[PDB]
Amino acid sequence: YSGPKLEDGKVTISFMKELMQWYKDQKKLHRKCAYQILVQVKEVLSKLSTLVETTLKETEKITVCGDTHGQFYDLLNIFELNGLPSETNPYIFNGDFVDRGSFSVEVILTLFGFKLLYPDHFHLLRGNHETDNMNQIYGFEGEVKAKYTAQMYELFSEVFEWLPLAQCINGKVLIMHGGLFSEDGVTLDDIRKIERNRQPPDSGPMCDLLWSDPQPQNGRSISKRGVSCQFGPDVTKAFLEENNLDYIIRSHEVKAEGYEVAHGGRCVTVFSAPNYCDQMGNKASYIHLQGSDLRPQFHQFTAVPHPNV
Numbered sequence: 001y002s003g004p005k006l007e008d009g010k011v012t013i014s015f016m017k018e019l020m021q022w023y024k025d026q027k028k029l030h031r032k033c034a035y036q037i038l039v040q041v042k043e044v045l046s047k048l049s050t051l052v053e054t055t056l057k058e059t060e061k062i063t064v065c066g067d068t069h070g071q072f073y074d075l076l077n078i079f080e081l082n083g084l085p086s087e088t089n090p091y092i093f094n095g096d097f098v099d100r101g102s103f104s105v106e107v108i109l110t111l112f113g114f115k116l117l118y119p120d121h122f123h124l125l126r127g128n129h130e131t132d133n134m135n136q137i138y139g140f141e142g143e144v145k146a147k148y149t150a151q152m153y154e155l156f157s158e159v160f161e162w163l164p165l166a167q168c169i170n171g172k173v174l175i176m177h178g179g180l181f182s183e184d185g186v187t188l189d190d191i192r193k194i195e196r197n198r199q200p201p202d203s204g205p206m207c208d209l210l211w212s213d214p215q216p217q218n219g220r221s222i223s224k225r226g227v228s229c230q231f232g233p234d235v236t237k238a239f240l241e242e243n244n245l246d247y248i249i250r251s252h253e254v255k256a257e258g259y260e261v262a263h264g265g266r267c268v269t270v271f272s273a274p275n276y277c278d279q280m281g282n283k284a285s286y287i288h289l290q291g292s293d294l295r296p297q298f299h300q301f302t303a304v305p306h307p308n309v
C-alpha cells in the first residue's frame with residue numbers, strides 16, 4: 001500500500017492533495033485511513049448546532065454548492081474552477097453528496113477530509129440522501145459494501161446523523177437542502193432545537209428541511225414526492241419576515257441552468273451535479289456571497305469526463 005497516509009493520525013493539506021489524485025486514478029483509500037476520518041469527523045460534527053450560524057465580515061466570501069451525487073470528477077472540477085477550500089476560500093455543500101453517481105465514496109471522504117482540515121470554513125449540510133432509507137435504494141450502501149464492508153457503511157450512516165440541517169449567514173441568508181415548512185410559525189430557534197441525530201421522521205420540521213420544494217402559486221400543496229410539501233411565495237415571505245431574513249438558498253432539484261431564483265428573489269435553488277446521472281444534460285452552478293453584499297452571484301459550469309463506470 002503506497003496510498004495516502006494521515007500524518008500523525010490527522011488530515012493535512014498534502015494528504016488531501018494525495019487523496020484527490022489517488023481517487024482521480026480510481027484507487028481506494030485504505031480502510032484504516034477511511035475509518036479515522038469517519039470517527040474524527042463524527043466528533044467534529046456532533047459538536048455543531050443543528051443550525052450553524054456563520055458571520056461573514058465585509059471582506060470575506062463563501063461559496064455555496066448544491067447536490068453533488070457522487071460525481072467526484074465534477075467535484076474536482078469545482079475545486080479547479082473555484083480553488084481548493086481554505087480559511088480564505090470557504091465552502092458550504094448543501095446536502096446530497098452521495099447516491100446516484102458512481103463515485104459517492106470518493107466524494108464523501110474528500111468532503112469529510114476537508115471538514116477535518118478546515119472545520120470553521122468548510123461546511124456540510126444534510127440532504128435527503130444522507131439517510132439509511134435512501135442509501136439502501138439509490139446506490140451508496142451498495143458502493144460502500146463493495147469497496148469496504150457493511151460495518152463501514154454503518155459508520156457512514158452514524159456520521160450522517162450528525163450533519164447540521166441548516167446554516168444561517170449574517171442572520172440574513174438561510175441555507176438548507178430542501179426548503180421551508182409544512183406549517184407556519186417555524187423560527188430559527190426551533191431549527192436550532194431540532195434533535196437531529198437520527199433518521200428523519202416522516203413529517204415535521206426535520207423532514208421539511210430535507211424534502212420540501214417551492215411552488216410558484218400561493219399556498220401549500222401535498223408533495224408529489226410522497227413526503228413534506230410544496231410551499232408558495234406567501235410561505236417564504238412570512239417565514240423571512242418573522243425571522244428577519246433576506247432569502248433562503250436551497251438545492252434538491254435539478255435545474256437546466258444549474259440554478260433558479262423563485263418567489264421574486266426570495267427562494268434560490270443551486271444544483272451542483274452537471275449532466276446529472278450522465279443523462280439530464282443540465283448545467284450546474286455554485287454561488288458566491290460576500291459579507292458586504294449577500295446577493296447571490298451564480299457561477300455556471302458543465303460536466304467533465306469521468307471513468308466509465
Ligand SMILES: O=C(O)[C@@H]1[C@H](C(=O)O)[C@H]2CC[C@@H]1O2
Nearest residue numbers: 067096128129252253254276
Ligand atoms: O434531491 C433530490 O431529491 C433530487 C434528486 C435526488 O437527490 O434524488 C436529484 C435530482 C434532482 C434532485 O437531486
Ligand SMILES: [Mn+2]
Nearest residue numbers: 096127128252
Ligand atoms: Mn435532495
Ligand SMILES: [Mn+2]
Nearest residue numbers: 067096252253
Ligand atoms: Mn439530490
